[PDB]
């Protein structure tokens, strides 16, 4: 998109250029330094996204000393960080008491304890910071809340309750201080969010203080006949998962859209009956709709899904990112429901939220669907009998009449082809996959009922669509994008089966976290995902809070790493996904050439498998999972992909077995016709 | 301006990771360009550096490498090959790209290195991630390996002549350490290279493997009557002070040069006799002359001073920096001898270097002078091998000075200043001439930055320990602000007490700290983003009169920033003013009630190569009209005791007060 402009007002002080350095290093762009006696009229504040008001002698109660800093705070309407004289400036300009502190403190350290909010995010409490002031903010007004204090018992941080203003008495940039660059990066982040915060719909919200069983909500509130979505936290775990979302295509503002890579056409079905056909690329279409149909996030909600698109992005959409249209999927290459009406379960607090759109102007009785569905939900609330889920094992095949595309022998060959390509330095890691087909007369909901019981996960889902049903028991987070523009990705790479005992379970759990091979498989994907995000994130923002964590589910142990970043200004949430699609964890590195190797060897499409599935909110947030451990149901057969990382140290036979281990949950669900 | 880096993408999934690290390290994001661009249409001459990204395949195939190839061979720019780039530099210069003993993909290695170029400041070992089956085996003589892996593979190389660097690891990888450091080193190596490319003179040089007594050289070779210079390392500690420099104005091409702030007039007097008075701001003029009189650094010299201007910068020149023209100096505000001929002592290796300038396509007896002068030495080398005083009148007496300190404390309480370097100025009638008194002074106080300027309007007799600015030709800057003083102890046990005391005192550390920040600020206005840093902090150095708390700061000049501009942006030294400098200097103006002149200025040399070495002017005696003027002072802060800070100034004068008696 672009980088962010930062203005740095100099109050003819002898520290301004230190702030210049720290802003430069933290944000990856140098600030524009202007003197405080500069002409505001002439100054093009239009072309700036943040201001920093430098330290300086004297007080802000003066035209000299402070000057044009005053305008930045009152008028500009922009994110501002006051430092020392600026911090003091914020106080008096909103009616604050800037008086003599107990002890003047020049070129001297204080321990600073703080909330950890805004400009103090990430910082430990306390930390060390150099002070340069006799004056100090004392009695704060009602508009300003303090964030940090000195050991001296003095205000070291503050902000405005409404406006995007921030202050520090201490000097981040001073050589005696710690976490200067962090603070400057925090302020960058705040400004990015602020700017991202700047509707043809009217969103009605309704809370119900009952929590039925999610399966009871699916069966009770939604129909078997019709297009339905169920985003299912079959596993609920504080921090990891909390919510479930359900809806259908019966509303008056709902739509259903497919895409074909081969045609290159967006087919969409209005609530009218109308069936439009554009010749677009899907990510382009999606970006536009999301921009046009924007809606702000409702504050009462504990989540940022305020309706929008729910569905899946197929692997073959790589054709319109960085890949080639090599193979043509049987199923849609994209497929979503525009959800105008949705039921949202909060497993943590034990309540429901109903959400429905009206057009800004006209009614469309969406408030009717609130009060009706509320009374339905109350009638479905009963004691769910606690039923612990058993872990699974290894010891074989892909099911009785299940035909793998590549049989074992064929796969062991393609593993060897992968191994050749790595020697010749064409890829470092190849995520080669198979595709198993198997007949089943089973309908989606009974079969999903079985799957979710076998393998409860944070990112399960049942999509019942006209062309196909997608029965996902995915544990994998692809992209979680805040409306504020924060991004998280948690690539899974590093698989291990569950232990037959509880001991051997810890043994495999520990082996997976310790092995060089698996850590390497994981690391290479971390770097690849950091790359994808760095393409559309702000410089400094991309980082890795956690590396080589082991998560455990009924079917398997997984090695997971967490990557985070913050979107650049102008970068839409859909741009961010296009940048990262397909996910590194399903392709390998380097992506482009790896995906070419995949095209030759797999000799056919992955379809929905390998893609992403989840939601894009009108708030601009998204939550997407990697499609793995997923059964695609269509035309009387069940299709499911399984894969694995092929690396220098891979063993043909062991890798083949890994694909089977992964098929277990799907294979067990299908068992019993 | 800021340095512009080109990153050549080789369709690899780590290019935007390099983008990130360059952005954070250099403070400026690279312009990314795919490997299949067009060399001509591409304006390579706009950029200052190239980072060649990794990739799949080989540097051989065009598929994989493309325009990167031409970046190394043709561009003539600084280049950093990362992985495939590193593999390309090996091969392009006739080296071998062969199979490594084990393919290493996303796997760490302990890298051990020499600490050179892209590895500067990094520990050995450090951890780095690898992504390659192939590795450099046979390096040409053109190429030189800098780093090695724990399995004995080449991890880093350079070209000996051209400014190429390769690393066979991924600094940008999450599993690697010191990635950002490496990208900064490359930025620094790129800045340096361009400053080496930026003539009216020929430079002749002659070494002589004998070392006479520094003082005797001054007596013998230089005259007592002329206008000479003597940059004197009266203290010679290894890696801290090594050289001494002497000359005179008995050259064809030599010039004396003076400036007055009042007039705004540069006054140059050639050896012809006739002067040439120009109305121009000094630093501008000095910058301009050093541009036109550029002379490449001689490589057989261990020092960078390849002749140039030797002299001082008076305090009052602040009027052209960030200060006001409040007071006229009795003395010239700048006084520089353009040295076309110089003797240079190397105290470490025990030899002399003679330097002399002939005009290009002319002969002015340089080589004739080198033999004459070098011969003279050899003979002398065997003969001689290696309170304020009685009639002294301070500007402010004690009572007055105490009341001026009070004013400082009041301005500090108001918050007009965080620290004020208040100074007094003692004058005293004396009988002695220049060389006899300096002889006493240098013996009393051996220091690294001693100096004896013997100019017409004044003699300067410095016993400065302090460094102000040491700028390289490569554009690297150092500054060691002294702030925090202590007397010596009577015995050896007393010295330890005081050494420890000075180190630990919160008051002193704060005094020093505020200057560190101030100097960082000044350097940052002229230096590359990320380049400014503080290797040492609150180091204590011991000299015959005092123990001094010293902190070291470094940086890199931006492209198109003259060494003169750097001196301008740092002048006067925060050491001698306090922060914030502008406001503090106005306070100083009001209270001191007169000029510092030479005192608290800078003294040293500006080389034709673009180097410089400037001391702060303290522990110094000016001579003019049979009168010895010396300045003393110290930092005033909120914690300052009036009576104590006065005593500090008397202690600081002991060397000067001793030398006169
Ligand atoms: N687990 C998510 C919601 C969710 C469940 N299944 C999903 C599938 C795709 C996307 C999101 C989801 C939460 O707790 O917030
Ligand atoms: N000690 C310096 C030279 C030097 C001695 N006295 C000086 C006075 C001013 C400037 C430089 C000097 C060196 O080692 O190179
Ligand atoms: Mg620090
Ligand atoms: Mg594997």
């Amino acid at each position: 998109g672009r980088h962010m402009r930062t203005l740095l007002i100099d109050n003819y002080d002898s520290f301004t250029h230190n702030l210049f350095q720290y802003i430069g290093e933290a944000t990856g762009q140098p600030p524009v330094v202007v003197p405080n006696d500069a002409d505001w009229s002439r100054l093009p504040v239009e072309d700036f996204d943040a201001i920093v008001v430098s330290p300086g002698p004297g007080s802000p109660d003066r035209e000299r000393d402070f000057g044009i800093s005053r305008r930045a705070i009152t008028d500009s309407g922009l994110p501002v960080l006051g430092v020392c004289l600026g911090h003091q400036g914020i106080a008096q300009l909103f009616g604050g008491t800037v008086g003599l502190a107990p002890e003047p403190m020049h070129g001297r350290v204080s321990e600073v304890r703080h909330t950890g909010e805004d400009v103090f995010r990430g910082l430990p409490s306390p930390f060390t910071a150099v002070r340069y002031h006799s004056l100090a903010a004392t009695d704060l007004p009602d508009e300003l809340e303090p964030l940090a204090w000195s050991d001296d018992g003095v205000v070291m941080g503050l902000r405005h309750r409404e406006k995007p203003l921030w202050g520090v008495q201490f000097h981040p940039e001073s050589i005696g201080s710690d976490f200067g660059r962090e603070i400057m990066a925090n302020f960058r982040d705040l400004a990015l969010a602020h700017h991202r915060a700047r509707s043809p719909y009217e969103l009605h919200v309704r809370r119900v203080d009952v929590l039925p069983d999610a399966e009871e909500v699916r069966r009770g509130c939604l129909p078997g006949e019709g297009t339905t979505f169920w985003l299912d936290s079959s596993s609920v775990l504080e921090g990891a998962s909390r919510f479930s979302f359900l809806g259908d295509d019966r509303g008056p503002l709902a739509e259903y859209l497919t895409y074909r890579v081969a045609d290159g056409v967006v087919s969409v079905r209005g609530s009218d009956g109308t069936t439009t056909r554009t010749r677009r690329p899907f990510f382009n279409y999606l970006e536009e709709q999301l921009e046009r149909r924007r809606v702000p996030v409702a504050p009462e909600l504990p989540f940022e899904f305020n309706l929008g698109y729910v569905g899946y992005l197929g692997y073959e959409l790589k054709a319109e990112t960085t890949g080639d249209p090599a193979h043509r999927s049987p199923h849609p290459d994209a497929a979503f429901l525009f959800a105008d009406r949705a039921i949202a379960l909060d497993h943590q607090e034990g309540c429901c939220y109903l959400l429905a759109l009206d057009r800004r102007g006209h009614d469309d009785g969406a408030r009717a669907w609130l009060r009706e569905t509320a009374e339905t939900l109350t009638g479905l609330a009963v004691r769910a009998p606690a039923e612990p889920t058993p872990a699974m094992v290894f010891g074989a095949g892909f099911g009785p009449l299940a035909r793998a595309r590549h049989d074992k022998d064929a796969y062991l060959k393609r593993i060897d082809e992968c191994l050749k390509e790595i020697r010749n330095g064409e890829s470092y890691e190849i995520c080669l996959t198979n595709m198993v087909t198997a007949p089943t007369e089973a309908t989606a909901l009974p079969l999903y009922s079985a799957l979710r019981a076998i393998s409860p996960v944070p990112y399960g889902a049942l999509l019942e669509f006209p062309e196909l049903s997608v029965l996902s028991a995915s544990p994998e987070r692809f992209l979680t994008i805040g409306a504020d523009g924060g991004v998280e990705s948690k690539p899974i790479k590093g698989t291990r089966p569950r232990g037959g005992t509880a001991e051997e379970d810890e043994r495999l759990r520990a082996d997976l976290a310790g092995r060089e091979k698996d850590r390497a498989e994981n690391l290479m994907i971390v770097d690849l995902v950091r790359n994808d995000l760095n393409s559309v994130c702000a410089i400094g923002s991309v980082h890795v809070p956690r590396l080589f964590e082991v998560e455990t589910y009924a079917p398997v142990h997984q090695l997971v790493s967490t990557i985070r970043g913050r979107l650049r200004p102008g970068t839409s949430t859909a741009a961010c996904v296009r940048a990262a699609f397909p996910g590194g964890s399903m392709t390998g590195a380097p992506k482009k050439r790896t995906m070419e190797i995949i095209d030759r060897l797999e000799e056919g499409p992955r379809g929905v498998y390998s893609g992403a599935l989840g939601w894009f909110a009108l708030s601009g947030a998204a939550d997407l999972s990697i499609v793995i451990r997923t059964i695609v149901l269509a035309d009387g057969q069940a299709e499911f992909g399984v894969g694995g990382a092929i690396v220098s140290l891979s063993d043909q036979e062991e890798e083949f077995t890994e694909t089977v281990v992964k098929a277990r949950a799907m294979v067990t669900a299908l068992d019993g016709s």
Side-chain angles (χ1 to χ4, degrees), chain A residues 517-518 521 644-647 650 655 658:
Chain A
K517 169 175 163 288
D518 299 67
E521 292 179 1
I646 313 294
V647 283
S650 287
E655 289 304 325
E658 189 171 301

Side-chain angles (χ1 to χ4, degrees), chain A residues 227-534:
Chain A
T227 290
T228 37
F229 76 83
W230 178 11
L231 300 193
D232 177 42
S233 297
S234 39
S235 168
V236 170
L237 200 84
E238 193 177 307
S241 53
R242 177 170 173 185
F243 302 116
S244 299
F245 302 102
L246 299 98
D248 57 13
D249 70 344
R250 283 192 300 155
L253 300 182
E255 307 180 349
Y256 175 71
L257 41 155
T258 43
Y259 187 76
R260 309 291 172 175
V261 161
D263 292 303
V265 300
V266 173
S267 301
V268 26
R269 184 216 73 192
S271 186
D272 314 349
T274 52
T275 307
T276 313
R277 284 186 57 256
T278 313
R279 192 192 189 296
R280 252 186 146 164
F282 180 75
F283 275 107
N284 208 237
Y285 179 80
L286 188 60
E287 184 176 71
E288 222 284 296
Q289 300 292 17
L290 283 174
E291 192 180 298
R292 207 191 63 170
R293 297 154 169 278
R294 275 190 292 218
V295 182
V297 64
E300 60 259 45
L301 302 194
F303 52 68
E304 297 185 304
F305 181 68
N306 57 355
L307 296 171
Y309 294 76
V310 182
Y312 74 83
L313 301 162
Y315 184 57
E316 282 67 41
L317 285 182
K318 62 191 171 71
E320 70 171 59
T321 64
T322 71
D324 299 307
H327 308 294
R328 179 199 278 71
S329 175
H331 323 297
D333 303 293
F336 286 73
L337 179 87
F338 181 66
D340 73 311
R341 295 182 168 179
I343 303 166
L345 308 195
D346 182 356
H347 300 295
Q348 185 183 252
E349 291 311 313
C351 66
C352 294
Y353 299 94
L354 308 180
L355 309 171
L357 291 179
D358 275 345
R359 311 204 215 84
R360 270 297 317 291
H362 222 294
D363 200 52
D364 312 300
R367 202 199 291 285
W369 180 97
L370 260 58
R371 94 89 165 132
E372 180 170 298
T373 306
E375 289 196 303
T376 296
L377 277 192
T378 61
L380 296 176
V382 297
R383 200 197 75 121
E387 41 183 50
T389 190
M392 292 183 88
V393 291
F394 82 100
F398 277 127
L401 278 189
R403 187 259 190 182
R405 176 185 302 182
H406 316 294
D407 71 51
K408 181 178 180 210
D409 202 305
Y411 205 75
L412 296 189
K413 181 188 159 196
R414 276 156 195 68
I415 298 162
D416 288 350
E417 282 295 340
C418 289
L419 281 168
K420 282 297 211 305
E421 295 289 6
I422 297 169
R423 292 193 195 75
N424 303 332
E426 298 287 289
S427 197
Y428 312 118
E429 157 171 344
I430 306 166
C431 188
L432 171 71
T433 67
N434 208 356
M435 182 60 64
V436 190
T437 309
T440 185
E441 260 286 278
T443 63
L445 172 59
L447 176 57
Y448 182 73
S449 181
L451 188 68
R452 72 186 301 274
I454 287 160
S455 171
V457 287
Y459 277 101
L462 173 67
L463 305 184
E464 296 163 80
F465 289 163
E467 294 83 353
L468 75 175
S469 303
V470 180
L471 280 68
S472 173
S474 177
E476 179 162 6
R477 163 175 297 179
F478 170 44
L479 287 174
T480 300
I481 301 169
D484 75 350
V487 182
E488 177 161 291
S489 188
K490 293 185 74 201
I492 293 185
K493 215 67 172 153
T495 314
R496 205 115 313 170
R498 291 293 296 279
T501 72
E503 277 68 0
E504 202 194 308
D505 209 45
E506 279 275 49
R507 200 192 58 58
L508 288 177
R509 189 175 155 77
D511 179 80
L512 170 62
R515 285 275 191 197
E516 189 183 357
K517 169 175 163 288
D518 299 67
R519 293 157 78 69
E521 292 179 1
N522 191 288
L523 189 155
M524 275 190 291
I525 301 300
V526 171
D527 278 352
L528 165 61
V529 167
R530 287 165 58 239
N531 187 71
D532 288 346
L533 288 182
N534 270 312

